[PDB]
Amino acid sequence: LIYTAGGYFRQSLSYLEAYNPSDGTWLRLADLQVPRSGLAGCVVGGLLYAVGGRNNSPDGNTDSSALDCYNPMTNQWSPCAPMSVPRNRIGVGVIDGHIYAVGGSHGCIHHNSVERYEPERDEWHLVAPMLTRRIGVGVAVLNRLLYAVGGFDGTNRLNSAECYYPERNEWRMITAMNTIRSGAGVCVLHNCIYAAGGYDGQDQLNSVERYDVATATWTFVAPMKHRRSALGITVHQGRIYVLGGYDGHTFLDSVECYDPDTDTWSEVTRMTSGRSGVGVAVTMEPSR
Template sequence: MDSNPGCSGFSQCWKIRSQCNQSSSDQSFASGLDPASYTFTAQGEMKCCIKSYQYDLLKSLYVMKHNQMLTDVRLDVVNETFHAHKIVLAAASPYFKAMFTSGLREKDASVVKLQGVCPTVMNKLLTFIYTGEIVINQLVVCQLLPTANMLQVSPVIQACCTFLENQLDPSNALGIAAFAEQHHCSNLYKAANEFIDQHFIQVCQEEEFLQLSSCQLVALIRRDHLNVREERDVYNAVLKWVRSNEEHRRPKMEDILGAVRCHYLSPSFLKDQMKNCDILRKVPACREHLAKIFQELSLHKSPCVPQRTPSAPCVLYIVAGFSRRSLNLFEAFSVSENKWLTLPPLPKSLSGLGGAFLRGMLYAVGGRENIPDALGHSGYVNAYDPVTSTWHSRADLLQTRHRAGLAVLDGYLYAVGGASGKTDLDTVERYNPERDQWELVAAMNTARVGVSAAVVNRLLYAIGGFHGVDRFKSVECFHPEKNEWLFVSAMNQERSGAGVVAVGQYIYVAGGMGLSGQLSSFERYDTEKDIWTQLSPMLTARSALTLAVLDKQIYAMGGFNGTSVVDTVEIYNLETDQWRVGPPLSCPRSGHATAAPFKTCNFTSATQSRSCPMMKAARNSPLALM
């Protein structure tokens, strides 16, 4: 007979339960009576996890601190006293851990005096140490972050940085960047400077900008990634800074002007400044500097300083075109998302139009209405603002133009050749965006329809095209100082309706209509050596296509293959001389316009703009005074 029947019964029960568990997978369930969860394993063990245990423990310690139970240190901050537990402080703060565990005199002290700390901030930090919760606002963050930094309470440092990053606004970004640098908050410093780069035009309108030292200003305007529409924005910001304290700052103008990339100012603007700017008249060295640059620009050589490359999203815009009828479809291709996005349609359905970016606006110029109810050439000009995502009407062309070339030179928009009704045009007109006015310049030597246009080093090139039955491989070059067109080396073969894009000193020409049909050939013109070079052909022969460059790659989009309009997109690698197939257009189209901002404006919808009412209100906050 078993001497201990109670134990025997328990062992038998345990054995059966263990065998049962081993015959099935691990089981777990949560008790309905408490927040604990229980997990049974195949080895007959049970794991108990009480998720609220840490919170309850902290809560108990907080109550004990509040009631001064087992507290072993008193923190004296100015005229206030805080009781705490050394072990809790040491666990939360490497600063206190070093104080209480090393050979410092405070190791065994029951009273510790903290210098340079605000009592309100200390109370918030202690509350966080004991509860894991803290409330941060604009009134306290500027004192809380330095104190958390000193005491090495990392979660609070990160929380303060997150709060400040969320508060970034043109009125306080410079101050937050300086604050972050002072307290070695590298992520916040990076975020603030990226914001400054992206919103430079707005930042330089604020009081903080005018309070920069000359060294700080030079460091700012030297940045490659300032998001400006044109270098004139940087130049005007410098003048504004000088004028805010002219007597003191004018002597520093020469050094500051050297940081402006004046080679990207137009000659007409330089000439106007040298003649009319009152500050330049008082600083002869600055006038001489601009005069030297003016002379260098007239030589049409590559600038000795690089153009700014803002860190804006890579976006490619495609406007209107033809697919059985003229279209008003307007889309953008986001490289980061690798997809096409639909934007507000062009006010008119057009094909054979031109497109180009000028001062942050996308211009859609000319074209032809080819729809069931209408057929006619257009002189319409519309400008799209990517920030507000809206179209705006501009002054019409002096004459209607279809299949004209369009390019930007010296801050003007040039419309080259094309057709007006049954007339092939040799005329060229340019648009002044400040006056909203078109004017004629010298005509080409040859009328050209389906002509392509590109600008390199302040020279405008008109490439190929046709007139009557003649198709051209000739190329003309427009010199703005002389107001005349001169022939340069011809292409390797005749073509009209080709895709053209300029990259550095080169002009790339793809496809088009040749003497016997659509072309796939691809060639490059070296503007400095006046030489054309054949490159790898496209995968698909087509005309009425467009080219654009994004992220060191050339995109060839749409067109007509001789039988049908296509949605084909091919991408050319400039380094490998290889083509690959890209994501197709949303629909087949030819005779469309394509343009890519030179990373000078953000692809941001109006609802995503940081100029929302909440951000405007932040300008009146204490952070705006940092």
């Protein structure tokens, strides 16, 4: 199933919903303990992790350092050890069963710091910071190297990308994207890194480009039907899925699916309600 967690439709949300690309159904699962937008989702050992974000509520506005773990076999959330700092509009990637939390913001503070979570010790540890402060950063993992793509440094939006080598604990700049993107959806399909949508400081984007490591090159592919920033993204059964986002006017509920063999995007479903800044990941379907 495609799990979407949190989000923001004029207030941060607690929804955890799971989409069945065969059924077309949306399953309503256990609410997040805290409403959160600008968070990220990932999966380790079948468990779904919600990382970072921000609680925008009628009575408060707090960025979040929290890490929480959802088990599809209990339909229960359970808290994990928190990150060293709150990270709204965070990026996350998974390498060797460890969760890397990248960038994000805490109030006026725009992080270049990165930290690593070990599920089997429930421990976070700081690693080398990025070359760039990046909020709304897209993160992907390819050949066990960690890519941070685009974002917003507090003053300028970025098309630059950099790559973290875990065993040498350093970041190196790579080829920059064709397009400046903050709040893009970034994932790793087959053996390429896709960056879709986002915001360049003037327009929400529908363009999609993919990075090939063998050629160290970014190449445009078919654009999405709808421009969107702060979209959710994941990969299911060889196809890219993008969920919601913001198009300058509306919080979208459209879900589009990219088939790399036809280079075609397709609107496949709508979420139960429009929202941006979700955390998306794919894991075992909930029992009973």
